[PDB]
């Protein structure tokens, strides 16, 4: 996205949250033009503020926005149960243009936060003798229930042939969710590695596995 | 602040197209041209598809034409494809710096493709064994509809405890995957000759076998 929100924050009821929206001085830092959208799941978003500080009318003030060179946040206090929800950000650009950030997934807290375990298999025999090299990276028991995950090809990125699952509450009442990356046979056997990168309540877990 | 009218559901089949509306007031959508469209995936982030009524962003295909007739705007979807299976926002501009948006459209696309699971079941990594952990995980993936049930086996016997199986998500391919993953201990991985994975999706089942080595 144009615009980079950090993909998950929390806190109890009652606590204050902040959350930011980083662009550059084109966009964000250019006018006072940013604004501000709340999105409960499945339901249309609203507009929450805009010209970086103004509330809609029927907004309540415990929300407010701000701004410094090329960084907006949007701050929630007194965080009540009807605040947990994603939240996106949007400015001005060039040319015309309108920018938005990734979003950002507010939880309120409704149990202890956990954090992920995290396991990363290697390619499966069977599947390589099918000419497939998947790799998986288990992600489970955590709370709240926002995770992302990146993986490497050594040290690069890779976003080509990677998929993870919407976390699920699990038996135990914490999230559980899978990546995996569908490489070659070819791809896995010439790297000097590859890694799940697991980032929860901004801590960024790595895993890594190599041939054998 | 009132919301522009959008029918919640809507349909078609592949290749066929859709047309869904989107009904504001004089002061809104009647009112200008700042009528924008957005298409979300459930779970996802959305993506504007058109604004200012009819233009469509770079990289989204000339399938997607925006109107609007007075008060009401319609968004037509042609050459109706899987990914198009999505909820669809409508937005206006009015007075007094308010955006007005529609409740959303669910658009389904009927009829699409039955899929057989891919399922791909891995032993216990090295690093997790040291960690003197040993889960298993069977990855199931590419199935359509989003629909499956798991069961395990130790040998040739059931297992009845320590599963944990996903809610399936539908990934990029518009297709289903989840994973099925069994908590063992090093001492139950090593005192069993194998252990395996059977997926039931649409009455047919897929069974998959990892052992020791
Ligand atoms: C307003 C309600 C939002 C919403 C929330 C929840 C559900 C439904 C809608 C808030 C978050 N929303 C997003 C959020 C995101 C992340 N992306 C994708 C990222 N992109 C797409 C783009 C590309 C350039 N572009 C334009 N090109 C040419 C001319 N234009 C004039 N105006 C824009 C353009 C379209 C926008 N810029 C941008 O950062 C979106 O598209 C829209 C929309």
């Known amino acids: 996205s144009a615009l980079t929100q950090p993909p998950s924050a929390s806190g109890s009821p009652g606590q204050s949250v902040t959350i930011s929206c980083?662009?550059?001085?084109?966009?964000?830092?250019?006018?006072?033009?940013?604004?501000?959208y709340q999105q409960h799941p499945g339901k249309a978003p609203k507009l929450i503020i805009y010209e970086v500080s103004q509330r809609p009318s029927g907004v309540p003030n415990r929300f407010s926005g701000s701004k410094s060179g090329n960084t907006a946040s949007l701050t929630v206090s007194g965080l009540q149960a009807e605040d947990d929800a994603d939240y996106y950000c949007?400015?001005?650009?060039?040319?015309?243009?309108?920018?938005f950030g990734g979003g950002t997934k507010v939880t309120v807290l409704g149990q202890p936060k956990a954090a992920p375990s995290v396991t990363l298999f290697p390619p499966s025999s069977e599947e390589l003798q099918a000419n497939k090299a998947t790799l998986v990276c288990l992600i489970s028991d955590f709370y709240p229930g926002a995770v992302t995950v990146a993986w490497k090809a050594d040290s690069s990125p890779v976003k080509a042939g990677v998929e993870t699952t919407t976390p699920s509450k699990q038996s135990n009442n914490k999230y559980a969710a899978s990546s995996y990356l569908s490489l070659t046979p070819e791809q896995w056997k010439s790297h000097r590695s590859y890694s799940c990168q697991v980032t929860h309540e901004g801590s960024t877990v790595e895993k890594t596995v190599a041939p054998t | 602040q009132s919301a522009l009218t959008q029918p919640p559901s809507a349909s078609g089949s592949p290749g066929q197209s859709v047309t869904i509306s989107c009904?504001?007031?004089?002061?809104?959508?009647?009112?200008?041209?700042?009528?924008?469209?957005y298409q979300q995936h459930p779970g996802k982030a959305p993506k504007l598809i058109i604004y200012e009524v009819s233009q469509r962003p770079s990289g989204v295909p000339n399938r997607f034409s925006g109107s609007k007739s007075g008060n009401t705007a319609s968004l037509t979807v042609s050459g109706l494809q899987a990914e198009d299976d999505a909820d669809?926002?409508?937005?206006?501009?009015?007075?007094?710096?308010?955006?007005?948006?529609?409740?959303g459209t669910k658009v389904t696309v009927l009829g699409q493709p039955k899929a057989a699971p891919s399922v791909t079941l891995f032993p216990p990594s090295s690093e997790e064994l040291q960690a003197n952990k040993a889960t298993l995980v069977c990855l199931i993936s590419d199935f359509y509809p989003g629909a499956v049930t798991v069961a395990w086996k130790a040998d040739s016997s059931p297992v009845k405890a320590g599963v944990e199986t996903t809610t399936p998500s539908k990934q990029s391919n518009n297709k289903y995957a989840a994973s099925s993953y069994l908590s063992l201990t090093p001492e139950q991985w090593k005192s069993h000759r194998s252990y395996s994975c059977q997926v039931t999706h649409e009455g047919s089942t897929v069974e998959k076998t990892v052992a020791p080595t």
């Open positions: 004089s002061s809104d959508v009647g009112g200008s041209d700042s």
């Open positions: 001085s084109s966009d964000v830092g250019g006018s006072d033009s």
């Open positions: 949007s400015s001005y650009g060039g040319d015309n243009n309108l920018f």
